[PDB]
Amino acid sequence: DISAKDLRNIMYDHLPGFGTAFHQLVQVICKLGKDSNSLDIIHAEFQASLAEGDSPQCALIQITKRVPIFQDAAPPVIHIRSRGDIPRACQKSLRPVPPSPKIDRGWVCVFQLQDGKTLGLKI
Amino acid sequence: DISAKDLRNIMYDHLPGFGTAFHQLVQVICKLGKDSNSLDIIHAEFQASLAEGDSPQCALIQITKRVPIFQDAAPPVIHIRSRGDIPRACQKSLRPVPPSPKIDRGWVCVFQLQDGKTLGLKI
Ligand SMILES: Cc1cccc(C(=O)C2=C(O)C(=O)N(c3ccc(CC(=O)O)cc3)[C@H]2c2cc(Cl)c3c(c2)OCO3)c1
Ligand SMILES: Cc1cccc(C(=O)C2=C(O)C(=O)N(c3ccc(CC(=O)O)cc3)[C@H]2c2cc(Cl)c3c(c2)OCO3)c1
């Protein structure tokens, strides 16, 4: 059986750069996947998209649009201290949070900072 | 000017018992009120409701219906370890989280537990 850590490693293996918004999307997919006992179907979808010739980035986005736990889903809230806790390669992807953000519309997660500031990570 | 702690103490002084769902609603009102620089209007609405003869419980609900930061607002996510971090008097008000919980519909907050469990506090 595949673990959340295994799936993270598999997905990271295909991504360029490091600490990018796509790496964070992997984290979200793995966390929500684990919490919904869906790591296997998610892995199968990822591999199937790659096998069709999709970019790994598109494979991750297709998971958000095809696997039902992400469809019309609000992004998870992640509590952190400051913007400094977020990798450099994610910084320019941070945005003010819109009213109903949705994972399948590119809103990966919402970071809540210790002083109450709130930023959404957008792809 | 009134602080979030001052307001919390004022509201607690009107509520019977301790650690109830209404005490948690005070916490949410004061935190969100502080983050939106809205403690003054919140206090004014609370006092006005009491002055019309409303119960302090209803005055708190009135705040969620009358102060625009709570109108059609999703409940805040609060990260905790387990149900053991929630006071005894709130336990029976914890519910599975519905698709679109709203503060002004009685969904005070969403507790996210460390193992991935999620519970909404409902009034
Ligand atoms: C930039 C940053 C700061 C702080 C946290 C994170 C982050 O995404 C996560 C972790 O540091 C982490 O350990 N997460 C995680 C991912 C999958 C599992 C499933 C498992 O292996 O048991 C567990 C933890 C990340 C994480 C991802 C999400 Cl969606 C979270 C979260 C943490 O808390 C609330 O929602 C990212
Ligand atoms: C049952 C339980 C467990 C853990 C936290 C709480 C809770 O509601 C909060 C606190 O322990 C706390 O210190 N909060 C709080 C309330 C107002 C302010 C404004 C200020 O005086 O600076 C600051 C902190 C409570 C709290 C309320 C909300 Cl809505 C929160 C939250 C914490 O984290 C994210 O969203 C309640």
Side-chain angles (χ1 to χ4, degrees), chain B residues 8 17 20 29 31 35 39 42 46-47 54 56 82 84 95 108:
Chain B
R8 178 204 73 189
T20 74
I29 286 169
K31 202 271 181 188
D35 288 350
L39 295 169
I42 288 165
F46 183 69
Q47 297 299 344
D54 286 328
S82 76
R95 306 294 155 68
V108 171

Side-chain angles (χ1 to χ4, degrees), chain B residues 9-68:
Chain B
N9 290 343
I10 287 172
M11 290 174 162
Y12 274 20
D13 280 344
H14 289 266
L15 290 177
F18 59 88
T20 74
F22 288 101
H23 289 85
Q24 183 59 21
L25 177 55
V26 170
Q27 296 290 151
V28 170
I29 286 169
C30 292
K31 202 271 181 188
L32 276 55
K34 185 180 178 196
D35 288 350
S36 292
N37 281 256
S38 288
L39 295 169
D40 179 282
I41 188 58
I42 288 165
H43 185 236
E45 294 282 2
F46 183 69
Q47 297 299 344
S49 175
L50 296 178
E52 294 295 336
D54 286 328
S55 64
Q57 295 89 346
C58 282
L60 294 172
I61 299 302
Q62 279 301 300
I63 284 165
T64 74
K65 296 187 182 298
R66 297 181 140 264
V67 179

Side-chain angles (χ1 to χ4, degrees), chain A residues 11-33:
Chain A
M11 290 172 163
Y12 274 21
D13 189 55
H14 291 269
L15 290 174
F18 209 66
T20 75
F22 287 97
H23 291 85
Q24 189 56 29
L25 176 57
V26 170
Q27 292 292 333
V28 169
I29 285 168
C30 290
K31 174 69 162 51
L32 276 53

Side-chain angles (χ1 to χ4, degrees), chain A:
Chain A
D1 280 23
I2 187 174
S3 73
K5 184 160 75 88
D6 292 332
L7 183 58
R8 181 204 66 191
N9 290 342
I10 288 162
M11 290 172 163
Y12 274 21
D13 189 55
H14 291 269
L15 290 174
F18 209 66
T20 75
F22 287 97
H23 291 85
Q24 189 56 29
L25 176 57
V26 170
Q27 292 292 333
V28 169
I29 285 168
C30 290
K31 174 69 162 51
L32 276 53
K34 188 180 176 175
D35 288 351
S36 283
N37 216 282
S38 289
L39 296 170
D40 177 276
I41 185 55
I42 289 161
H43 182 243
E45 290 284 352
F46 181 71
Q47 296 295 351
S49 294
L50 293 180
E52 291 297 329
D54 286 333
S55 68
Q57 297 89 347
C58 278
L60 294 173
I61 296 307
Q62 284 296 313
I63 283 161
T64 73
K65 289 171 183 282
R66 291 180 171 249
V67 177
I69 62 172
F70 302 109
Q71 294 175 334
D72 221 17
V77 172
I78 304 173
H79 278 98
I80 62 176
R81 290 194 317 202
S82 76
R83 241 182 129 142
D85 294 321
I86 299 172
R88 193 155 279 127
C90 277
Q91 296 287 334
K92 291 187 182 63
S93 300
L94 297 169
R95 308 289 155 73
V97 184
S100 321
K102 297 292 196 268
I103 301 177
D104 60 355
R105 293 182 189 267
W107 294 95
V108 173
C109 61
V110 168
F111 292 109
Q112 179 77 19
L113 284 45
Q114 187 157 353
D115 72 342
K117 287 173 170 60
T118 307
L119 290 166
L121 183 71
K122 180 61 166 57
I123 293 178

